[PDB]
Design a protein around this motif. Sequence first.
Motif, PDB file in Angstrom:
ATOM      1  N   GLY B  27       0.808  -1.217   0.000  1.00 56.12           N
ATOM      2  CA  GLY B  27       0.000   0.000   0.000  1.00 56.12           C
ATOM      3  C   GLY B  27       0.842   1.267   0.000  1.00 56.12           C
ATOM      4  N   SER B  28       0.314   2.305   0.653  1.00 56.82           N
ATOM      5  CA  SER B  28       0.961   3.605   0.752  1.00 56.82           C
ATOM      6  C   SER B  28       1.105   3.986   2.223  1.00 56.82           C
ATOM      7  CB  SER B  28       0.154   4.674   0.000  1.00 56.82           C
ATOM      8  N   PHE B  29       2.166   4.717   2.530  1.00 55.75           N
ATOM      9  CA  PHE B  29       2.588   4.953   3.902  1.00 55.75           C
ATOM     10  C   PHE B  29       2.131   6.295   4.516  1.00 55.75           C
ATOM     11  CE2 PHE B  29       5.999   6.698   6.646  1.00 55.75           C
ATOM     12  CZ  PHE B  29       5.855   5.823   7.720  1.00 55.75           C
ATOM     13  N   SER B  30       2.197   7.363   3.742  1.00 53.45           N
ATOM     14  CA  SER B  30       2.098   8.709   4.309  1.00 53.45           C
ATOM     15  C   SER B  30       0.767   9.122   4.949  1.00 53.45           C
ATOM     16  CB  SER B  30       2.475   9.739   3.253  1.00 53.45           C
ATOM     17  OG  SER B  30       3.882   9.802   3.118  1.00 53.45           O
ATOM     18  N   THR B  31      -0.362   8.659   4.421  1.00 51.46           N
ATOM     19  CA  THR B  31      -1.642   9.185   4.880  1.00 51.46           C
ATOM     20  C   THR B  31      -2.504   8.183   5.649  1.00 51.46           C
ATOM     21  OG1 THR B  31      -2.746   8.733   2.794  1.00 51.46           O
ATOM     22  CG2 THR B  31      -1.680  10.865   3.040  1.00 51.46           C
ATOM     23  N   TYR B  32      -1.866   7.224   6.299  1.00 47.10           N
ATOM     24  CA  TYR B  32      -2.590   6.320   7.180  1.00 47.10           C
ATOM     25  C   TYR B  32      -1.992   6.349   8.568  1.00 47.10           C
ATOM     26  CZ  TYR B  32      -4.910   4.918   2.940  1.00 47.10           C
ATOM     27  OH  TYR B  32      -5.664   4.928   1.792  1.00 47.10           O
ATOM     28  N   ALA B  33      -2.847   6.366   9.581  1.00 46.23           N
ATOM     29  CA  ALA B  33      -2.407   6.603  10.954  1.00 46.23           C
ATOM     30  C   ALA B  33      -1.760   5.364  11.543  1.00 46.23           C
ATOM     31  CB  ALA B  33      -3.590   7.039  11.819  1.00 46.23           C
ATOM     32  N   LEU B  34      -0.617   5.548  12.192  1.00 46.24           N
ATOM     33  CA  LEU B  34       0.067   4.427  12.832  1.00 46.24           C
ATOM     34  C   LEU B  34       0.235   4.609  14.347  1.00 46.24           C
ATOM     35  CD1 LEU B  34       2.725   2.105  11.852  1.00 46.24           C
ATOM     36  CD2 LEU B  34       3.250   3.616  13.847  1.00 46.24           C
ATOM     37  N   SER B  35      -0.233   3.653  15.137  1.00 48.77           N
ATOM     38  CA  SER B  35      -0.171   3.769  16.588  1.00 48.77           C
ATOM     39  C   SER B  35       0.771   2.749  17.247  1.00 48.77           C
ATOM     40  CB  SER B  35      -1.576   3.623  17.173  1.00 48.77           C
ATOM     41  OG  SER B  35      -2.381   4.742  16.847  1.00 48.77           O
ATOM     42  N   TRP B  36       1.250   3.070  18.444  1.00 51.11           N
ATOM     43  CA  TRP B  36       2.001   2.105  19.234  1.00 51.11           C
ATOM     44  C   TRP B  36       1.180   1.620  20.399  1.00 51.11           C
ATOM     45  CZ3 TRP B  36       6.451  -0.009  17.641  1.00 51.11           C
ATOM     46  CH2 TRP B  36       7.148   0.660  16.629  1.00 51.11           C
ATOM     47  N   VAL B  37       1.064   0.305  20.517  1.00 46.08           N
ATOM     48  CA  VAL B  37       0.245  -0.303  21.540  1.00 46.08           C
ATOM     49  C   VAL B  37       1.067  -1.341  22.263  1.00 46.08           C
ATOM     50  CG1 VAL B  37      -1.725  -1.797  21.985  1.00 46.08           C
ATOM     51  CG2 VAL B  37      -1.839  -0.007  20.173  1.00 46.08           C
ATOM     52  N   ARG B  38       1.212  -1.217  23.577  1.00 45.52           N
ATOM     53  CA  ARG B  38       2.075  -2.142  24.285  1.00 45.52           C
ATOM     54  C   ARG B  38       1.275  -3.065  25.158  1.00 45.52           C
ATOM     55  NH1 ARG B  38       5.443   0.902  29.130  1.00 45.52           N
ATOM     56  NH2 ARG B  38       3.663   1.457  30.490  1.00 45.52           N
ATOM     57  N   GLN B  39       1.947  -4.107  25.621  1.00 50.41           N
ATOM     58  CA  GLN B  39       1.298  -5.143  26.401  1.00 50.41           C
ATOM     59  C   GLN B  39       2.280  -5.720  27.408  1.00 50.41           C
ATOM     60  OE1 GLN B  39      -0.150  -8.671  24.189  1.00 50.41           O
ATOM     61  NE2 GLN B  39      -1.804  -8.731  25.710  1.00 50.41           N
ATOM     62  N   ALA B  40       2.099  -5.392  28.687  1.00 43.45           N
ATOM     63  CA  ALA B  40       2.897  -6.019  29.746  1.00 43.45           C
ATOM     64  C   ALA B  40       2.577  -7.528  29.858  1.00 43.45           C
ATOM     65  CB  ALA B  40       2.667  -5.326  31.066  1.00 43.45           C
ATOM     66  N   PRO B  41       3.515  -8.323  30.382  1.00 41.00           N
ATOM     67  CA  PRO B  41       3.257  -9.756  30.347  1.00 41.00           C
ATOM     68  C   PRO B  41       2.070 -10.131  31.216  1.00 41.00           C
ATOM     69  CG  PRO B  41       5.560  -9.294  30.946  1.00 41.00           C
ATOM     70  CD  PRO B  41       4.787  -8.005  31.051  1.00 41.00           C
ATOM     71  N   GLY B  42       1.230 -11.027  30.706  1.00 40.59           N
ATOM     72  CA  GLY B  42       0.050 -11.509  31.434  1.00 40.59           C
ATOM     73  C   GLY B  42      -1.090 -10.510  31.514  1.00 40.59           C
ATOM     74  N   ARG B  43      -0.825  -9.274  31.117  1.00 38.61           N
ATOM     75  CA  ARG B  43      -1.811  -8.210  31.246  1.00 38.61           C
ATOM     76  C   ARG B  43      -2.286  -7.787  29.864  1.00 38.61           C
ATOM     77  NH1 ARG B  43      -0.998  -3.714  33.160  1.00 38.61           N
ATOM     78  NH2 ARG B  43      -2.749  -3.591  34.644  1.00 38.61           N
ATOM     79  N   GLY B  44      -3.077  -6.715  29.808  1.00 39.16           N
ATOM     80  CA  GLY B  44      -3.814  -6.352  28.592  1.00 39.16           C
ATOM     81  C   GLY B  44      -3.198  -5.230  27.775  1.00 39.16           C
ATOM     82  N   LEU B  45      -3.815  -4.915  26.638  1.00 35.87           N
ATOM     83  CA  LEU B  45      -3.281  -3.902  25.705  1.00 35.87           C
ATOM     84  C   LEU B  45      -3.445  -2.463  26.213  1.00 35.87           C
ATOM     85  CD1 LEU B  45      -4.600  -5.452  22.312  1.00 35.87           C
ATOM     86  CD2 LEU B  45      -2.269  -5.632  23.213  1.00 35.87           C
ATOM     87  N   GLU B  46      -2.436  -1.637  25.925  1.00 39.54           N
ATOM     88  CA  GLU B  46      -2.407  -0.208  26.286  1.00 39.54           C
ATOM     89  C   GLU B  46      -1.940   0.646  25.093  1.00 39.54           C
ATOM     90  N   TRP B  47      -2.824   1.540  24.657  1.00 43.61           N
ATOM     91  CA  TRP B  47      -2.515   2.528  23.639  1.00 43.61           C
ATOM     92  C   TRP B  47      -1.640   3.673  24.174  1.00 43.61           C
ATOM     93  CZ3 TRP B  47      -3.482   7.725  22.518  1.00 43.61           C
ATOM     94  CH2 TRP B  47      -3.269   8.081  21.186  1.00 43.61           C
TER      95      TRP B  47
END
Lengths: 109, 125, 18
Positions: B27-47
Amino acid sequence: EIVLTQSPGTQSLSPGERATLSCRASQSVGNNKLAWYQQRPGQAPRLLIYGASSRPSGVADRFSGSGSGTDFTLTISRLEPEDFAVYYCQQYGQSLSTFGQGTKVEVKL
Amino acid sequence: QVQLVQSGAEVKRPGSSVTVSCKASGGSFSTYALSWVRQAPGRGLEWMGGVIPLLTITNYAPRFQGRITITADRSTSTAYLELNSLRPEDTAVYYCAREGTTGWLGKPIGAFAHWGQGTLVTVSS
Amino acid sequence: DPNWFDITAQLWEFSQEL
Ligand SMILES: [Ca+2]
Protein backbone atom coordinates in the motif's frame (compact mmCIF):
# COMPACT_ATOMS: atom_id res chain seq x y z
CA GLU A 1 -10.01 9.53 29.69
CA ILE A 2 -12.65 6.85 28.99
CA VAL A 3 -12.54 3.54 30.86
CA LEU A 4 -13.74 0.44 29.06
CA THR A 5 -14.80 -2.20 31.56
CA GLN A 6 -15.15 -5.69 30.03
CA SER A 7 -17.48 -8.33 31.38
CA PRO A 8 -17.21 -11.22 32.11
CA GLY A 9 -13.54 -11.65 33.03
CA THR A 10 -13.57 -15.32 32.03
CA GLN A 11 -16.09 -17.01 29.73
CA SER A 12 -16.00 -20.80 29.99
CA LEU A 13 -17.84 -22.51 27.12
CA SER A 14 -17.85 -25.58 24.83
CA PRO A 15 -17.20 -25.76 21.04
CA GLY A 16 -20.34 -24.95 19.05
CA GLU A 17 -21.89 -22.87 21.84
CA ARG A 18 -22.56 -19.12 21.86
CA ALA A 19 -20.36 -16.36 23.33
CA THR A 20 -21.74 -12.97 24.40
CA LEU A 21 -19.04 -10.51 25.53
CA SER A 22 -19.74 -7.11 27.15
CA CYS A 23 -17.87 -3.79 26.94
CA ARG A 24 -18.91 -0.93 29.22
CA ALA A 25 -17.57 2.56 28.52
CA SER A 26 -17.44 5.17 31.32
CA GLN A 27 -18.68 7.89 28.95
CA SER A 28 -20.36 7.87 25.55
CA VAL A 29 -18.04 6.69 22.78
CA GLY A 30 -17.70 9.49 20.21
CA ASN A 31 -19.42 8.52 16.94
CA ASN A 32 -19.64 4.84 17.99
CA LYS A 33 -15.92 4.55 17.17
CA LEU A 34 -15.46 1.25 19.04
CA ALA A 35 -13.54 -1.82 17.81
CA TRP A 36 -13.10 -5.45 18.90
CA TYR A 37 -9.89 -7.50 18.64
CA GLN A 38 -8.96 -11.21 18.90
CA GLN A 39 -5.60 -12.29 20.32
CA ARG A 40 -4.20 -15.85 20.41
CA PRO A 41 -1.18 -16.65 22.61
CA GLY A 42 2.03 -15.18 21.23
CA GLN A 43 0.19 -13.60 18.31
CA ALA A 44 -0.54 -9.98 17.53
CA PRO A 45 -4.19 -9.04 17.96
CA ARG A 46 -6.54 -9.21 14.97
CA LEU A 47 -9.31 -6.77 13.93
CA LEU A 48 -12.79 -8.33 14.10
CA ILE A 49 -15.25 -5.46 14.37
CA TYR A 50 -14.83 -1.77 13.60
CA GLY A 51 -17.20 1.18 13.98
CA ALA A 52 -19.18 -0.85 16.53
CA SER A 53 -20.74 -3.27 14.04
CA SER A 54 -18.76 -3.24 10.77
CA ARG A 55 -16.72 -6.25 9.65
CA PRO A 56 -13.45 -6.18 7.70
CA SER A 57 -13.15 -8.44 4.67
CA GLY A 58 -11.78 -11.91 5.62
CA VAL A 59 -13.34 -11.80 9.09
CA ALA A 60 -15.72 -14.67 9.82
CA ASP A 61 -19.51 -14.41 9.41
CA ARG A 62 -20.21 -15.80 12.89
CA PHE A 63 -18.77 -12.61 14.51
CA SER A 64 -21.17 -9.76 15.14
CA GLY A 65 -20.82 -6.34 16.76
CA SER A 66 -23.57 -4.18 18.26
CA GLY A 67 -24.38 -1.31 20.61
CA SER A 68 -24.32 2.48 20.95
CA GLY A 69 -23.03 5.04 23.45
CA THR A 70 -21.89 3.23 26.58
CA ASP A 71 -22.87 -0.46 26.21
CA PHE A 72 -21.44 -2.69 23.47
CA THR A 73 -21.64 -6.40 22.80
CA LEU A 74 -19.48 -8.79 20.80
CA THR A 75 -21.29 -11.99 19.93
CA ILE A 76 -19.97 -15.22 18.51
CA SER A 77 -22.77 -17.45 17.23
CA ARG A 78 -21.07 -20.86 16.82
CA LEU A 79 -17.77 -21.08 18.76
CA GLU A 80 -15.17 -22.85 16.61
CA PRO A 81 -12.08 -24.25 18.36
CA GLU A 82 -9.96 -21.49 16.84
CA ASP A 83 -11.90 -18.86 18.85
CA PHE A 84 -10.68 -19.67 22.34
CA ALA A 85 -8.49 -16.59 22.66
CA VAL A 86 -8.52 -13.28 24.55
CA TYR A 87 -10.72 -10.46 23.25
CA TYR A 88 -10.19 -6.72 23.65
CA CYS A 89 -12.53 -3.75 22.99
CA GLN A 90 -11.18 -0.34 21.94
CA GLN A 91 -12.52 3.20 21.61
CA TYR A 92 -11.10 5.75 19.19
CA GLY A 93 -13.88 8.33 19.47
CA GLN A 94 -11.52 10.95 20.86
CA SER A 95 -7.77 11.61 20.46
CA LEU A 96 -7.06 9.65 23.66
CA SER A 97 -7.75 6.01 22.75
CA THR A 98 -8.20 3.33 25.40
CA PHE A 99 -8.52 -0.45 25.56
CA GLY A 100 -10.54 -2.70 27.85
CA GLN A 101 -8.85 -5.17 30.23
CA GLY A 102 -10.07 -8.03 28.03
CA THR A 103 -12.09 -11.22 28.32
CA LYS A 104 -10.49 -14.68 28.45
CA VAL A 105 -12.67 -17.12 26.50
CA GLU A 106 -11.42 -20.54 27.63
CA VAL A 107 -12.50 -24.12 26.97
CA LYS A 108 -14.50 -25.48 29.92
CA LEU A 109 -14.02 -29.08 31.13
CA GLN B 1 -2.66 -5.90 2.27
CA VAL B 2 0.11 -4.32 4.34
CA GLN B 3 2.97 -6.02 6.17
CA LEU B 4 4.61 -4.38 9.17
CA VAL B 5 7.90 -5.73 10.57
CA GLN B 6 9.34 -4.51 13.85
CA SER B 7 12.92 -4.36 15.10
CA GLY B 8 13.94 -7.15 17.41
CA ALA B 9 13.94 -7.91 21.10
CA GLU B 10 15.94 -5.45 23.19
CA VAL B 11 17.33 -5.48 26.77
CA LYS B 12 17.58 -2.17 28.74
CA ARG B 13 18.66 -0.92 32.16
CA PRO B 14 16.56 1.44 34.27
CA GLY B 15 17.03 5.10 33.40
CA SER B 16 17.82 4.43 29.77
CA SER B 17 16.04 5.00 26.48
CA VAL B 18 14.63 2.60 23.84
CA THR B 19 13.76 3.17 20.20
CA VAL B 20 11.70 0.55 18.37
CA SER B 21 11.33 0.59 14.60
CA CYS B 22 8.31 -0.49 12.54
CA LYS B 23 8.90 -0.82 8.78
CA ALA B 24 5.87 -0.83 6.43
CA SER B 25 5.57 -2.60 3.08
CA GLY B 26 2.60 -2.69 0.69
CA GLY B 27 0.00 0.00 0.00
CA SER B 28 0.96 3.61 0.75
CA PHE B 29 2.59 4.95 3.90
CA SER B 30 2.10 8.71 4.31
CA THR B 31 -1.64 9.19 4.88
CA TYR B 32 -2.59 6.32 7.18
CA ALA B 33 -2.41 6.60 10.95
CA LEU B 34 0.07 4.43 12.83
CA SER B 35 -0.17 3.77 16.59
CA TRP B 36 2.00 2.10 19.23
CA VAL B 37 0.24 -0.30 21.54
CA ARG B 38 2.07 -2.14 24.29
CA GLN B 39 1.30 -5.14 26.40
CA ALA B 40 2.90 -6.02 29.75
CA PRO B 41 3.26 -9.76 30.35
CA GLY B 42 0.05 -11.51 31.43
CA ARG B 43 -1.81 -8.21 31.25
CA GLY B 44 -3.81 -6.35 28.59
CA LEU B 45 -3.28 -3.90 25.71
CA GLU B 46 -2.41 -0.21 26.29
CA TRP B 47 -2.52 2.53 23.64
CA MET B 48 0.51 4.89 23.94
CA GLY B 49 0.20 7.26 21.00
CA GLY B 50 0.42 7.44 17.24
CA VAL B 51 1.50 9.45 14.22
CA ILE B 52 0.34 10.42 10.73
CA PRO B 53 3.55 10.48 8.70
CA LEU B 54 2.37 13.26 6.36
CA LEU B 55 3.33 16.40 8.33
CA THR B 56 4.29 14.17 11.29
CA ILE B 57 0.99 14.87 13.07
CA THR B 58 1.49 13.31 16.52
CA ASN B 59 -0.93 12.38 19.26
CA TYR B 60 0.31 11.08 22.64
CA ALA B 61 -1.47 9.45 25.53
CA PRO B 62 -1.11 11.84 28.53
CA ARG B 63 0.58 9.26 30.82
CA PHE B 64 3.57 9.08 28.44
CA GLN B 65 3.76 12.77 27.67
CA GLY B 66 7.34 13.95 28.22
CA ARG B 67 8.87 10.45 27.99
CA ILE B 68 7.68 9.54 24.50
CA THR B 69 8.57 10.59 20.95
CA ILE B 70 7.04 9.21 17.77
CA THR B 71 8.62 9.86 14.38
CA ALA B 72 8.00 8.71 10.82
CA ASP B 73 10.33 8.49 7.83
CA ARG B 74 8.61 8.79 4.47
CA SER B 75 11.41 7.49 2.26
CA THR B 76 11.69 4.22 4.19
CA SER B 77 8.06 3.78 5.21
CA THR B 78 9.36 3.36 8.75
CA ALA B 79 7.88 4.68 11.99
CA TYR B 80 9.79 4.92 15.29
CA LEU B 81 8.83 4.87 18.98
CA GLU B 82 11.24 6.41 21.51
CA LEU B 83 10.48 5.85 25.19
CA ASN B 84 12.91 7.17 27.77
CA SER B 85 13.31 7.25 31.55
CA LEU B 86 12.62 3.49 31.50
CA ARG B 87 11.70 1.52 34.63
CA PRO B 88 11.04 -2.24 35.08
CA GLU B 89 7.31 -1.48 34.91
CA ASP B 90 7.99 -0.64 31.23
CA THR B 91 8.87 -4.28 30.51
CA ALA B 92 6.48 -5.35 27.77
CA VAL B 93 5.91 -6.32 24.14
CA TYR B 94 5.52 -3.23 21.97
CA TYR B 95 3.36 -3.26 18.83
CA CYS B 96 3.02 -0.95 15.86
CA ALA B 97 -0.52 -0.75 14.49
CA ARG B 98 -1.75 0.90 11.36
CA GLU B 99 -5.16 2.08 10.21
CA GLY B 100 -7.33 -0.24 8.11
CA THR B 101 -9.02 0.68 4.84
CA THR B 102 -12.45 0.04 3.32
CA GLY B 103 -13.22 -2.30 0.44
CA TRP B 104 -5.28 -0.81 -0.15
CA LEU B 105 -5.64 2.89 -1.10
CA GLY B 106 -9.25 2.92 0.22
CA LYS B 107 -10.90 5.07 2.90
CA PRO B 108 -9.20 4.73 6.32
CA ILE B 109 -11.30 3.16 9.07
CA GLY B 110 -9.43 4.46 12.16
CA ALA B 111 -9.39 1.04 13.82
CA PHE B 112 -6.27 -1.07 13.61
CA ALA B 113 -6.37 -3.64 10.82
CA HIS B 114 -2.58 -4.23 10.54
CA TRP B 115 -0.10 -5.23 13.24
CA GLY B 116 3.64 -5.68 13.46
CA GLN B 117 4.92 -8.87 15.11
CA GLY B 118 5.74 -7.14 18.40
CA THR B 119 8.96 -6.23 20.17
CA LEU B 120 9.70 -7.48 23.69
CA VAL B 121 11.62 -4.79 25.59
CA THR B 122 12.85 -5.90 29.02
CA VAL B 123 13.90 -3.31 31.61
CA SER B 124 15.89 -4.77 34.51
CA SER B 125 18.87 -4.40 36.83
CA ASP C 1 -13.14 18.28 20.64
CA PRO C 2 -11.44 17.50 17.29
CA ASN C 3 -10.50 13.83 17.01
CA TRP C 4 -7.05 12.97 15.76
CA PHE C 5 -8.52 9.70 14.46
CA ASP C 6 -10.59 11.66 11.90
CA ILE C 7 -7.70 13.50 10.29
CA THR C 8 -6.81 10.81 7.72
CA ALA C 9 -10.49 10.63 6.67
CA GLN C 10 -10.07 14.24 5.52
CA LEU C 11 -6.76 13.45 3.82
CA TRP C 12 -8.73 10.82 1.85
CA GLU C 13 -11.70 13.01 0.86
CA PHE C 14 -9.08 15.47 -0.39
CA SER C 15 -7.36 13.00 -2.70
CA GLN C 16 -10.70 12.06 -4.26
CA GLU C 17 -10.48 15.66 -5.49
CA LEU C 18 -6.76 15.72 -6.39
CA1 LIG D 1 16.50 0.10 18.98
